[PDB]
């Protein structure tokens, strides 16, 4: 499992379904088979979905994940009672796969802003891209591109621009970031 | 265009381009009668450029000649051996000093104090204690003198070398000689301690307003008798306080002459004096006959100071006359016509062509306080520093709120103690790139792009490659505190606005306007005025944006009013812009408004409030 970096917006955009589920009783990874022959191993979670964000209606009842962390370990806890929004690949009837590689975080991690982007925010900037800045110095050409440089500020995924940012789409077809609950304006002016 | 060069009567002004570099490289770099031996040899100008920031190109006649054109100490930068003993340190801790000579530009009380303040600069950081004596030889003989003053090291007329002092030793060891042809002041222009009227004790307040015209030197306007009066505050029409300006031709002090004016000439023992002398005196006090034969009639009074409208030149102080013709054109203001050194003169009759009577319009002068400070260190053994913010730096730089520099504290304490009966100076001079730097303000002031800090500004026009500096911010703006914050200049009136602490300054034409520096309350913002973060103008809206905290502000640079209920947070127009940006700048054309925070900037597009270009401050601007 070698997962590439992305902004928590793309998640809610590239992901089929996003919801906060939890593990009641793990659907003990059962049988399978493959090339070498031997059975396919797959972790399975019994889940309780609070609410759904995006995705198809056939609500998730159990989560599934590749055998070993080595390949993509989304080992999460049961009993405990922590929540996880994890927007894995939606599979028919409550089936959804979580690859360690997927946007997956305990409910408590996200900020007051990150959660509220679930209903409308993030969902407004999908017709938009989110460039990741290689090295100071970096640039953006297209009118729809938004410069994302956490590698610069905070090497890790979780960083200012991810914790509080969302690259919306302008009324001209172009795009740009934000912070707050007020989308309606260009530049502060007065009647002259 | 083909700018005419003239010789003014009294001034001897050849020195063309290099010509000077020749006379000005051996004074502080040892290289006599011969045109420096840089021909088959290469040394001289090099070490000159070592000092003063290393723009080592060679003779660099384009940028370097402007540095030997700045007012400096009379002391050499190299070879400490110039007569003062090898060991530069007083063998004592109780050091006497005596004021032998004074200067007409200042009343002897001001001079007396001016010095004593200088010494204190050193005492406050040393077990050294200076006590003035009025008789016999002391450790420091303080005097003023002109070219050829008696020690073999001549001064050069007005401007140029300001003074000089020998390092600790015998007799001449430690003496401090200040240049008499200079205009000594407390730093900000001519000073005149008023004599009569309703404010007998005060200093003339120049400028001052009377009859709707600003006066910067004593005047006889109003009067009919010819006397000199100056107002004792800015607004005469409101305050009404003033006094008369001292002048031996007008009156005198004490003695037995009852205020009567000097008589010229006046005979004293086979010599006829045409001005006051100190002949016969050791308190260094100018005196004079009030009758034509001092001996016979024995009538006299003192001459504690002389007021003057004009300086230098050949008009003995005569006020300017406007308009005046020179080379065929009339001038109604001081000019630099005929001058190549930029100095500003005017005519003392309506026509220079016919009369050749001129003078210098008095500039800011030099602070006896400061000049003596540096000097005194020399006398305590100290040697010329290479640190722009160091008092013991050769070039003169007027700082209202002067503080010894660590560099100084260091050097002086290194020789002597620190504080009898643990603190330090604090900050040091920031280095270009070497270390991380969060500037106090970046700004487009004129054409140059200044970078700010504690007491320093680096700046440049277009070169991103490498700015210049460091230079004391007080070079251009003295009344500015030792750590400014946001700063901008209104392209609608070309006024340099400086924010700092609870107040703000607004310079225009190298001078702050009456009333400023006001707090930010009367500026526009609420009492939040504790401090600011950044500010600038729009490249398309042409307004001011005062960023402070999580919330930005607005100002009418096109009107006096204010916009409806700000503060509103960045929640509206600004986008990527982070909380509290260190600075904001808009350059010529482009439409980009760079925002500064941390160690990197964020390019903003005015044409479209969105974003762009995230870059490394150090690598992009501020050349590394
Ligand atoms: Ca001089
Ligand atoms: Zn010096
Ligand atoms: Zn001397």
UniProtKB/Swiss-Prot annotation, chain A:
Residues 1-4, 69-70 are annotated as: Involved in metalloproteinase-binding. Residues 1-126 form the NTR domain. Pfam families: TIMP (PF00965). Disulfide bonds join 1-72, 3-101, 13-126, 128-175, 133-138, 146-167. This is Metalloproteinase inhibitor 2. Its main location: secreted. The gene is TIMP2. The record marks 14, 35, 41 as: Involved in metalloproteinase-binding. It is found in: Secreted. The keyword Nucleus does not apply. GO terms for biological process: negative regulation of membrane protein ectodomain proteolysis; negative regulation of metallopeptidase activity; response to cytokine; response to hormone. Belongs to the protease inhibitor I35 (TIMP) family. Complexes with metalloproteinases (such as collagenases) and irreversibly inactivates them by binding to their catalytic zinc cofactor. Known to act on MMP-1, MMP-2, MMP-3, MMP-7, MMP-8, MMP-9, MMP-10, MMP-13, MMP-14, MMP-15, MMP-16 and MMP-19. GO terms for molecular function: metalloendopeptidase inhibitor activity; molecular function inhibitor activity; peptidase inhibitor activity; protease binding; zinc ion binding. The keyword Secreted applies. Interacts (via the C-terminal) with MMP2 (via the C-terminal PEX domain); the interaction inhibits the MMP2 activity. GO terms for cellular component: collagen-containing extracellular matrix; extracellular matrix; extracellular region; extracellular space; ficolin-1-rich granule lumen; specific granule lumen; tertiary granule lumen.
Swiss-Prot record, chain B:
Gene3D superfamilies: Collagenase (Catalytic Domain) (3.40.390.10), Fibronectin, type II, collagen-binding (2.10.10.10), Hemopexin-like domain (2.110.10.10). GO terms for biological process: angiogenesis; blood vessel maturation; bone trabecula formation; cell migration; cellular response to amino acid stimulus; cellular response to estradiol stimulus; cellular response to fluid shear stress; cellular response to interleukin-1. Residues 81-192 are annotated as: Collagenase-like 1. SMART domains: FN2, HX, ZnMc. InterPro entries: FN_type2_dom, FN_type2_sf, Hemopexin-like_dom, Hemopexin-like_dom_sf, Hemopexin-like_repeat, Hemopexin_CS, Kringle-like, M10A_MMP. Ca(2+) 3 binds at residues 156-157, 179, 182. One of its GO terms (molecular function) is fibronectin binding. GO terms for cellular component: collagen-containing extracellular matrix; extracellular region; extracellular space; mitochondrion; nucleus; plasma membrane; sarcomere. Ca(2+) 2 binds at residues 139, 171, 173, 175. Binds 4 Ca(2+) ions per subunit. Phosphorylation on multiple sites modulates enzymatic activity. Phosphorylated by PKC in vitro. The propeptide is processed by MMP14 (MT-MMP1) and MMP16 (MT-MMP3). Autocatalytic cleavage in the C-terminal produces the anti-angiogenic peptide, PEX. This processing appears to be facilitated by binding integrinv/beta3. Residues 193-367 are annotated as: Collagen-binding. Residues 385-624 are annotated as: Required for inhibitor TIMP2 binding. The conserved cysteine present in the cysteine-switch motif binds the catalytic zinc ion, thus inhibiting the enzyme. The dissociation of the cysteine from the zinc ion upon the activation-peptide release activates the enzyme. This is 72 kDa type IV collagenase.
């Amino acid at each position: 499992c070698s997962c590439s970096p992305v902004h928590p917006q793309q998640a809610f955009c590239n992901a089929d379904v996003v919801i906060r589920a939890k593990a009641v009783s793990e659907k003990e990874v059962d049988s399978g088979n493959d090339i070498y022959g031997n059975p396919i191993k797959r972790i399975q979670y019994e889940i309780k979905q609070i609410k759904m964000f995006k995705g198809p209606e056939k609500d998730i009842e159990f989560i599934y994940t590749a055998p070993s962390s080595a390949v993509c370990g989304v080992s999460l806890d049961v009993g405990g009672k922590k929540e996880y929004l994890i927007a894995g690949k939606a599979e028919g009837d409550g089936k959804m796969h979580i690859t360690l590689c997927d946007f997956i975080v305990p409910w408590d991690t996200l900020s007051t802003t990150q959660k509220k982007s679930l209903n409308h925010r993030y969902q407004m900037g999908c017709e938009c891209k989110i460039t990741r800045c290689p090295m100071i110095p970096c640039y953006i050409s297209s009118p729809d591109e938004c410069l994302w440089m956490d590698w610069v500020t905070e090497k890790n995924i979780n960083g200012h621009q991810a914790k509080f940012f969302a690259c919306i789409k302008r009324s001209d077809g172009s795009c740009a970031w934000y912070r707050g609950a007020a989308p309606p304006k260009q530049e502060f002016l007065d009647i002259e | 265009a083909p700018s005419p060069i003239i010789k003014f009567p009294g001034d001897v002004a050849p020195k063309t381009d290099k010509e000077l570099a020749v006379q000005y490289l051996n004074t502080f770099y040892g290289c006599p009668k011969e045109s420096c031996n840089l021909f088959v040899l290469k040394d001289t100008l090099k070490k000159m450029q070592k000092f003063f920031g290393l723009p080592q190109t060679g003779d660099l006649d384009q940028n370097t000649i402007e540095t030997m054109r700045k007012p400096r100490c009379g002391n050499p930068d190299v070879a400490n051996y110039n007569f003062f003993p090898r060991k530069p340190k007083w063998d004592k801790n109780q050091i006497t000093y005596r004021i032998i000579g004074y200067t007409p530009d200042l009343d002897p009380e001001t001079v007396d104090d001016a010095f004593a303040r200088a010494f204190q600069v050193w005492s406050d950081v040393t077990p050294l204690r200076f006590s003035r004596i009025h008789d016999g030889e002391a450790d420091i003989m303080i005097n003023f003198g002109r070219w050829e003053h008696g020690d073999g090291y001549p001064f050069d007329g007005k401007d140029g070398l300001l003074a000089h002092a020998f390092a600790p030793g015998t007799g001449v060891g430690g003496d401090s000689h200040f240049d008499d042809d200079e205009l000594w002041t407390l730093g900000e222009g001519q000073v005149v301690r008023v004599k009569y009227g309703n404010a007998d004790g005060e200093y003339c307040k120049f400028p001052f307003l009377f009859n709707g015209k600003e006066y910067n030197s004593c005047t006889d306007t109003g009067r009919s008798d010819g006397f000199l009066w100056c107002s004792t505050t800015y607004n005469f029409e409101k305050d009404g306080k003033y006094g008369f300006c001292p002048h031996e031709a007008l009156f005198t002090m004490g003695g037995n002459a009852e205020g009567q004016p000097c008589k010229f000439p006046f005979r004293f023992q086979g010599t006829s004096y045409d001005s006051c002398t100190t002949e016969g005196r050791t308190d260094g006090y100018r005196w004079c006959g009030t009758t034509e034969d001092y001996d016979r009639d024995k009538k006299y009074g003192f001459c504690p100071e002389t007021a003057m409208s004009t300086v230098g030149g050949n008009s003995e102080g005569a006020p300017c006359v406007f308009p005046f013709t020179f080379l065929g054109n009339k001038y109604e203001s001081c000019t630099s016509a005929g001058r190549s050194d930029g100095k500003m003169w005017c005519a003392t009759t309506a026509n220079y062509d016919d009369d050749r009577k001129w003078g210098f319009c008095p500039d800011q002068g030099y602070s006896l306080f400061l000049v003596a400070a540096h000097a005194f260190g020399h006398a305590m053994g100290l040697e010329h520093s290479q640190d722009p913010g160091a008092l013991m730096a050769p070039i003169y730089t007027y700082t209202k709120n002067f503080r010894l520099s660590q560099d100084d504290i260091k050097g002086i304490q290194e020789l002597y103690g620190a504080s009898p009966d643990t603190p330090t100076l604090g900050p040091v001079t920031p280095e270009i790139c070497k270390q991380d730097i969060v500037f106090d303000g970046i700004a487009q002031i004129r054409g140059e792009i200044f970078f700010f800090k504690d007491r320093f500004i680096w700046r440049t026009v277009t070169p991103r490659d490498k700015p210049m500096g460091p230079l004391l911010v007080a070079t251009f703006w003295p009344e500015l505190p030792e750590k400014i914050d946001a700063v901008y200049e209104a392209p609608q009136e070309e006024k340099a606005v400086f924010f700092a602490g609870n107040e703000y300054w607004i310079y225009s034409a190298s001078t702050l306007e009456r009333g400023y520096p006001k707090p930010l309350t009367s500026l526009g913002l609420p009492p939040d005025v504790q401090r600011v973060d950044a500010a600038f103008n729009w490249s398309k809206n042409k307004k001011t944006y005062i960023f402070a905290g999580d919330k930005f502000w607005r100002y009418n640079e096109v009107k006096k009013k204010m916009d409806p209920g700000f503060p509103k947070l960045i929640a509206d127009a600004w986008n990527a812009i982070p909380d509290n940006l260190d600075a904001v700048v808009d350059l010529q054309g482009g439409g980009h408004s760079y925002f500064f925070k941390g160690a990197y900037y964020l390019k903003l597009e005015n044409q479209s409030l969105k974003s762009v270009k995230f870059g490394s401050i150090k690598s992009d601007w501020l050349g590394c």
